[PDB]
Paper text:
To generalize this engineering approach for crystal contacts, a non-ADH-homologous enzyme was selected to apply the established strategies to the Nostoc sp. This oxidoreductase from the old yellow enzyme family (OYE, EC 1.6.99.1) catalyzes the trans-hydrogenations of activated alkenes, demonstrating its industrial relevance as a biocatalyst. JA81 and Acaryochloris marina with a higher NADH affinity. For this study, the NostocER1 Loop1,5 variant (NostocER1-L1,5) was selected as an example protein for the rational introduction of Lys–Glu interactions at crystal contacts to demonstrate the impact of rational single amino acid exchanges on the crystallizability of proteins and enhance protein crystallization.
Out of the nine tested NspER1-L1,5 mutants produced in E. coli, six crystallized, while four mutants revealed an increased propensity to crystallize in static µL-batch crystallization compared to the wild type: Q204K, Q350K, D352K, and T354K. The best-performing mutant Q204K was selected for upscaling, crystallizing faster than the wild type in a stirred batch crystallizer. In addition, crystallization of 3.75 g L−1 Q204K revealed an extended nucleation window toward lower protein concentrations for this mutant. Out of these seven, three mutants (43%) crystallized significantly better than the NspER1-L1,5 WT, as demonstrated by five different parameters defined for enhanced crystallizability (see Section 1): Q204K (5/5), D352K (2/5), and T354K (2/5). Subsequently, the protein concentration of mutant Q204K decreased significantly slower, and the equilibrium was reached at 0.4 g L−1 within 19.5 h with a crystal yield of 91.7%. Mutants Q204K and Q350K crystallized in space group P212121, with the RMSD of the crystalline environment in this crystal packing indicating structural differences.
Author numbering: 14 to 370
Amino acid sequence: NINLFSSYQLGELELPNRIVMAPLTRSRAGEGNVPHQLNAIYYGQRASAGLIIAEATQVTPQGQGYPHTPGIHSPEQVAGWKLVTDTVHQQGGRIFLQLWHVGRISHPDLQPDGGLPVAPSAIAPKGEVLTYEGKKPYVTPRALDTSEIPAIVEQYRQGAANALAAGFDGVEIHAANGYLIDQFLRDGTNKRTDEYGGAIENRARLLLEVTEAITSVWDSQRVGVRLSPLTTLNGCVDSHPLETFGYVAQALNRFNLSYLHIFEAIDADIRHGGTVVPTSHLRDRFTGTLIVNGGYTREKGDTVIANKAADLVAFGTLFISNPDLPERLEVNAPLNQADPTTFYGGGEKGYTDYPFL
Ligand SMILES: Cc1cc2nc3c(=O)[nH]c(=O)nc-3n(C[C@H](O)[C@H](O)[C@H](O)COP(=O)(O)O)c2cc1C
């Protein structure tokens, strides 16, 4: 009888429970986009998680899309992250870094030399983007040259190697939520005619090349991949998600990864006519550990673990507001309510001051 509190062997790591802290952008980086002691407190408070996945962290300057998100490209950023991984480990936890490149979800004001954001195809996102001068229309991104794709892969590889020097236990590739890798995956955002567009094998090529590079830095059992098959976030949608994401799930098996992590969009059932990509399809296709996420509770999480539908369950919103979420779930305690107005930016309030039981 396994449940949310059962231990799990994740490669060489013993996880004390099946509860994962999902990656959560909090936009509280310091000067130079460097993590600092307040960030270390925040993650240290949550070290009872079976595994923490740290917030999306840009692997290279062009991969930033929102003010004040941390990076993992500079020595100062490695040193600030070391504060965080030191604290997590002192508190008996385990933490992977989520490696990010936003692709077209950015603005020139956030890019080096005021350049265009890069993408598979020159398609401006709809709406507005936050900059250091407030909100502005998105611009049309530049479509990467075929010859530039090795440089993207190398930026992810270096980001991964910097994460290893920062003392993380592993890394998660952010291939979800309409960021650069997802922009290549999905046919709504990828109109390319080279070997990185068209057929699914081509649209998955960036993800597979990034994963191969990262597994040359980390033991593969310390490398995870996140997908979000039915999100519509950031204007990024695929016309045949079952075929696209089922293919990806199988194609990742060669790498013997730590896990596949599925963010199950909250509106999937009500949007369209029903869920077009049952997570069970991906569970059957991917031969390793599966993390599921999206609206979980004690009762939903226990159910998926008991019936072999997933191995780990990640919680986002509840970990914002409940630093001791595992303890609270275990004893059916009250749960603190998350305050969205302090999700992003700021200081201790809405970050490290949510109370423990
Ligand atoms: C404030 C906030 C920030 C987020 N930042 C990230 C991120 O950095 N990386 C990511 O992959 N997902 C991110 N997400 C999505 C969450 O990881 C999670 O998948 C989503 O909130 C659904 O899970 P939940 O219902 O348990 O909150 C974020 C969500 C929230 C609420």
